Amino acid sequence: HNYEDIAQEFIDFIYKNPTTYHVVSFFAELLDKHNFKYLSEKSNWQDSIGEDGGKFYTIRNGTNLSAFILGKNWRAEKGVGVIGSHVDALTVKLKPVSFKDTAEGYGRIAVAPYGGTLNELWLDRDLGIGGRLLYKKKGTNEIKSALVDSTPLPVCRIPSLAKEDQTIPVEPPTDDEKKSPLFGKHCIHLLRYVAKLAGVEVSELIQMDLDLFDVQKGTIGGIGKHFLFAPRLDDRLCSFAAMIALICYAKDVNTEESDLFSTVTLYDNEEIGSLTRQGAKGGLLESVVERSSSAFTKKPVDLHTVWANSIILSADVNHLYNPNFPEVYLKNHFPVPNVGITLSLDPNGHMATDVVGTALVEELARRNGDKVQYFQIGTIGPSLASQTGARTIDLGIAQLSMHSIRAATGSKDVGLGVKFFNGFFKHWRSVYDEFGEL
């Protein structure tokens, strides 16, 4: 009510955090200012998690984040309430050696598509450069990370004609600059430019993982302002909604009076099939849960009983009804904007032969005043379901023109998404109890 924007907050979030690194870093800052404590995955957690439980988060690779709330009174039979989503998006990436010699004076860079064989939709769009630099300051032996972002400067673009065709229109090297490990691999100007943004010298740059992304800020749109146009909606839209839902929920939770175990886990490499250590199949969720339950109590914890009592919402976007292409959609099985969360059903696929998860989500929405929509036609749901043995439901916030460089969704859909996910954390355990043995 007037606070369904929130859509502006989302638009600012996509605009200010273009790469996966930025998104994870942004959530890290948001979590710890809500008193979630960072745990290194490289250290054992026995002495970091106690009888009281608490609020925590861990990070793998700077692109895979898990945030969790563990109750003082949690036990195996309570299970875990999980929302799983992905934070990688389709982009163009600077190649390891991005160096191209001039084409009639034009400066260019070797780049590769990430997550697809990219569209004509990427042509004639203003593209910023940004992501992660690795560097070693002089007279040190620590390799540190810096985040870099050219916004609002579009440093390049893939021109249409009015890795041969899709290429990009973008003084002498100092002795020190030649000492850099990246000297031959990237043109000196680009290196000088990223070095400037990070606040380090060119000679100190070890490596980089840079994207090219649309710098056009998102907008509320439509004559009645029913829509939201923005880049990278898949699946930063569900990720944002789930994380904000968890943090709003965490507000009213003293972990000492809780018997729940709740988590939002955000994965990398969904666009690539998820079979990486930062992806859904790398098992960060399962790692978090086993570690937490191990560190938390002296008693042994039966993980099979934990997962048998758990519910995983595998949150990934569905397709809005495109009124221009009615034939691809199935009648009575397509979502519309500004209504509510969409349940992905597929006759083949992991949720066929599981009517219970569908029923549970319907009951939740009923209790919380939400609406649910249907959509029948390396996704993380099947991976997580089979990896844990826990009942998993595929759903999400529907959008138009998915895997476009600029997608569309309802202007109320971020808020409705946060609302549904907030309701899930509050009620899933109670609602799942009445299915009993099922």
Place this chain on the structure above:
Amino acid sequence: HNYEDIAQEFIDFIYKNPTTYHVVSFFAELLDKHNFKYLSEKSNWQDSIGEDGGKFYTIRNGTNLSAFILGKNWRAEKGVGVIGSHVDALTVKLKPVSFKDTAEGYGRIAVAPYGGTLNELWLDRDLGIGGRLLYKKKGTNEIKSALVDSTPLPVCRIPSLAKEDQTIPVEPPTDDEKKSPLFGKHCIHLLRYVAKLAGVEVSELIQMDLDLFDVQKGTIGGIGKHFLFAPRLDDRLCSFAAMIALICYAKDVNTEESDLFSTVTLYDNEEIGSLTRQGAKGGLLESVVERSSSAFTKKPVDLHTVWANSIILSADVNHLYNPNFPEVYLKNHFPVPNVGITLSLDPNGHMATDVVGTALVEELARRNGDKVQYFQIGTIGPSLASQTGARTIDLGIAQLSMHSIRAATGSKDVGLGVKFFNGFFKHWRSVYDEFGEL
């Protein structure tokens, strides 16, 4: 000998138990009247399994069942004797919203194929409706399950012309009926009909997972009665044979005088690639074994040693020689009916480079008086083998016209299958001992 029918018992079993729900439920009743004890997967088993071991079974989702016999004197070095098979079959499923408005007075329903893009073989067949309903009785807060089956009434059929073409030819709503969660999603008549079968009100129906299946009862066939014609043979044929084998074997087992760990595990979603929590990759088998060995003894159990000493028969059907298509078959590598179990060999595939499993099965058959046949050309064998590290052999009972709505096999093949599997449980440990380190 006269008791190789058993084929009638099988025919009655397929006829009376059309969906996966019915099949699992049927086995649950058979097991517990043979004194197997049900364990909830949602409860820890420490205090349900003791020093004596025992006979048990557990169920996941109503479609994934594991039955096991744990010996009082079992130890890691004995391993597990496993038969793994699947109970899902190709069917048509009622869509989540099955509602179609009338086509010139004809009533119809939206349905989807499960496990394939379905055949012309499904045209002009009498189709019953059946499966699982979820319901909540009035003034309650328990969601219960009921099984429903229209047999012998064919409620519908997919007509040939003498999800556009393959669709199906099948008073006013009470206020109470409109109160049902499924009111808009399925036509009132269908809801009234399934409600009647379950013995509940329409208003009490929460959700349903219904199939459409062939109601034509199986028959012994051929002029010399050499064949068995029936629906859903893949892989309810191996599942039946393996379960009956285990139960016949269990008869002569006092668990107090046993040092063996035996199981038949039945999976869902093999036709869909097995990557679901109810499928082979959901790890019910491994869950059962870890839980049992944990609960059973105070000593710690090395699971790697258990699997290194185990044998898994991954039981799935092979192809009978179709004399009409000799060229697709490979000479000296095709099974015939009424001879015995068929070993699936594949030069690429998980049993290439493992001659030991083949040798073991041959030795077993030799000892038990069985015959073995060969067949070289998300299967569960590779999944289970890699998931456990245990030596796994793909084999099964061969059939004709697999993935037809009505398949064929030997009339003696159910009995021979039970015979072979019964021999396996009796002798595998002894036979595998002489391979020693291999």
Place this chain on the structure above:
Amino acid sequence: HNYEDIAQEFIDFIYKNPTTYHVVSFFAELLDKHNFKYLSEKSNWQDSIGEDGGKFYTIRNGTNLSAFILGKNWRAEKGVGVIGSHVDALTVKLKPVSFKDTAEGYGRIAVAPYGGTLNELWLDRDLGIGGRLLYKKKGTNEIKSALVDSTPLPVCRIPSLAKEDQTIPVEPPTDDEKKSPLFGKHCIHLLRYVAKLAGVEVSELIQMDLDLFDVQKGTIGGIGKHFLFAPRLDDRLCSFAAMIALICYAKDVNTEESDLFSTVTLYDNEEIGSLTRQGAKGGLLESVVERSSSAFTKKPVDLHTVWANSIILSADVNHLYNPNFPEVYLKNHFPVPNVGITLSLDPNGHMATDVVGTALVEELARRNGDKVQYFQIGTIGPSLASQTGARTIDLGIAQLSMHSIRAATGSKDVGLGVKFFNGFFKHWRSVYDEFGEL
């Protein structure tokens, strides 16, 4: 009213009488227990038909039957009320030499499709064997006929792969057995099997004309039981309805108080184009009428005047609206189930330019309380019309999936068909009188 089953009687009739031989034999038994007298076509009828007229039937080839009621007071100007239909159906036939040598131990038989190049619809269906055997008992010189039927035993099936491809999966010869004329032509087991069914020796078998047919019994179907699923509906459905109509009508007829000449004639070989001596072009109808009118009175009978005053209903099935394929059907010219008889209209074809027959059928239905449906898009109507000169109307009971091995129609359609045809015999003469010269 409660007696619109009648659908069960029809289902039992198709089930118990699989071949044309069985169907004709069945009608022969029904007719003569309703006091119709058999006339041999090989004997002159002068002294078998008298001044009183009577109820009669004759048979050609065991597959072509004519039943008629001749009134004592009949005259040329009264004409004949004719229903013409066919009793042959699409089947597979055993070839004259059905012998195939074993294919890896499998027994097989050479067969040919009758009436089409047969469907994938014939694959994986349980097939019985049955039809006519000719035999000569030992020390005799009479060649007799026996009917044979394996129902409910499916002796074979045409397998799908999971006259090359469509072929069929099915001790030493006695000296006497080698003496049979069919010894080399059919495998000894099949011959022994059919000999057993007939109650004769193998050595006594002269010849056989055997079909392979679906042994699946028909069912009432649909959630509201609106449908009838059964094999061989075309055109045993109209044949049954017409014959039962005649017999119900014959009940209230003393031939001594009648001035009508009524007949139902059932033809063979409609699926083959009708140009056989047992088909519509073999002229059994015309033969019956000329013979009867010759034998019946001493006065000469003008046959041209008889036919000029006659009405022939050429009863053959039309197509039900298949809601899955709306585009093949013509709006306002397609029948629905459980409504009534369907009039076949075709802008090209023999009923174009004859509006009078259509009008007469409409008037009949009006008088008898029937409903009439339309269907615009070697048929017997054109043959009979041109052969007699008599006004002929094409109509019938509509069905789905015609020329499938299992077709569908209304559950009320047999009864409505009998009702319409019964009304026709009662009123055609009276209704046709008001068209006068037309």
